[PDB]
Every structure is written in C-alpha cells, then in structure tokens.
C-alpha cells in the first residue's frame, strides 16, 4: 500500500512538533511535602496532579542530569558528610565515619536536587520536557528503585498537552511507569514502561517524584531501540519549549501516519 496502515485502534502515542525556540533540558518544579507523611504520596490523583495544589517552592530549568540520589548528613567526629544509605548501620553510624550524632528523622536543607535550596528529605518535584527519539522503535523507560514514590508519563494528553509544557498539570493517571508507594507497604510491582516512538517527534515527558523522610532515590534510565541504555544524563534527548497555545498544528495525534 502507498501509505502505512497506522497503529491499530488509533493506538499510537500522541506527540508534538513545537515550532518555537528549543531549549536543552527539563524544567523542575518543587512543591511542599510534609516530613514523615507516608500516606499522601500513595494516591494516584496526588502523584498525577494533586501535588500542584500545595505550595510551590520554586523551580529550575534546563536540567539534563535527572536521576535523584540524595543522602542525609552524618554529623561525625571528623565533620559533616553525606552518608550512602547502604553504609548506614546501627543507631546510627556511617561506615568510615563512626557514630553519627544527628537524627535520621528531621528535615535537612541542601542544594542536592538540581542546585535548588530546599528540603530533599521532604519534597515533591515535577520534571517536564519533551523526549526526542533519535531512532524509530520501542523505548523502555525504567526506575532502578523508588524511594519514596514516583511516576513517569510519556505522550501528548498523558504527560501534558502539546505546546503547553508550562500549564497546570493535566489529570491523566495513565502512567508509563507506576512507581507509587503501595499502601500495603510493599514494593511497587512494575517499575519499567515501554513506548513506541517515531524519530524526530517531540514526546511530552513528565516525572513526579516524592520523598517523605531521609534518603531519596530515583535512578532513571531508558533503553533505546538499538538496545543501548542511557542512564541519569539525558543530554541530547530532553528539551523544553515555552508555551505557545496558539500554534494550531502543534499536536500530532498519530505519528504513525503523519
Ligand atoms: O538531584 C538531581 C540532579 O541534581 C543536579 O544538580 C546534579 O548535578 C545531578 O547529578 C542530579 O541528577
Ligand atoms: O518509609 C520508608 C523509609 O524507609 C527508610 O529505610 C528509608 O531510608 C527512607 O528513605 C524511606 O523513606
Ligand atoms: Ca488532549
Ligand atoms: Ca525516603
Ligand atoms: Cl565506621
Ligand atoms: Na544514595
Ligand atoms: Na551533608
């Protein structure tokens, strides 16, 4: 046939072709989250959009290194240094530092999350941008682990609306990765998600991440159609565009036929 038939039952992921000035990296918005609140972030509605009802603390733009690896301080005999959680022991010390005098359960202030001065012990953040596939095919996004709660969404009308990156979050709970902290205290079951993507189209991408106490961890990767994996640093893959709600042709509902 002269043309491709298109993905079955209109199943292709919606993408965009914003015509404005492209900027490298993703925008990160920070929102209030209560220390030791282990319930709020277990709700899908909260993780999809409810987070933005809380106080907005600030933002940073142009971020290409997007994994989270926040370690709390150990106030030790030789000074105060961050402690890798796997090196924490007893009640409590940090291997190579001796006993720590400080509490694991209070808020700590730091610029570790994207250079923004906040409380990485207790915070919710929203990463937005567009993912640009260099190759046509199946992409598998992954979280290596989640502490405390997280989602990843890809696609127009799922992550956000085309050419409307800066708008209040949309209500879709159709997550690409559901890493929401289970109520049952369990581990989130599936922390990978696959999307078929067409080279050169801009795919809206949203990551919402929350921490309630102490350590925070979110190692983000993507496996490309060629089988290679990009981890942590998504430079060359992720971009931002200022809103242009007047660009009529910005949405591509079916890139499999466009
Ligand atoms: O914590 C999120 C990001 O913050 C940035 O300031 C760091 O340079 C990155 O290594 C990290 O992925
Ligand atoms: O409530 C779960 C908590 O368990 C602790 O072992 C982790 O270190 C915290 O970072 C986590 O938030
Ligand atoms: Ca829509
Ligand atoms: Ca934590
Ligand atoms: Cl030690
Ligand atoms: Na860590
Ligand atoms: Na520290």
UniProtKB/Swiss-Prot annotation:
Which part of the full protein is shown? 23 to 271 of 1075
State the name under which the record lists this protein: Flocculation protein FLO5
Which GO cellular component terms are attached? cell periphery; extracellular region; fungal-type cell wall; side of membrane
Please give the function described in this protein's UniProt entry.
Cell wall protein that participates directly in adhesive cell-cell interactions during yeast flocculation, a reversible, asexual and Ca(2+)-dependent process in which cells adhere to form aggregates (flocs) consisting of thousands of cells. The lectin-like protein sticks out of the cell wall of flocculent cells and selectively binds mannose residues in the cell walls of adjacent cells. Activity is inhibited by mannose, but not by glucose, maltose, sucrose or galactose.
**Source organism's superkingdom?**
Eukaryota
The scientific name of the source species is Saccharomyces cerevisiae (strain ATCC 204508 / S288c) (Baker's yeast)
Per the record, which residues fall in region Sugar recognition?
Answer: 184-227
- Where does this chain mainly localize? secreted
Q: What is known of its domains?
A: The number of the intragenic tandem repeats varies between different S.cerevisiae strains. There is a linear correlation between protein size and the extend of adhesion: the more repeats, the stronger the adhesion properties and the greater the fraction of flocculating cells.
* Keyword line: Cell wall, Glycoprotein, GPI-anchor, Lipoprotein, Membrane, Repeat, Secreted, Signal
Protein modification: Extensively O-glycosylated.
Spans traversing the lipid bilayer:
none
Per the UniProt annotation, where are the glycans attached? 122, 174, 190, 249
Gene Ontology annotations of biological process type: cell-substrate adhesion; flocculation
| An example Gene Ontology molecular-function term | D-mannose binding
> According to its UniProt record, where is this protein located?
Secreted, Cell wall; Membrane
* Applied biotechnology uses: For many industrial applications in which the yeast S.cerevisiae is used, e.g. beer, wine and alcohol production, appropriate flocculation behavior is one of the most important characteristics of a good production strain. The ability of yeast cells to flocculate is of considerable importance, as it provides an effective, environment-friendly, simple and cost-free way to separate yeast cells from the fermentation product at the end of fermentation.
Residues annotated as domain PA14:
61-236
Return the similarity comment: Belongs to the flocculin family.
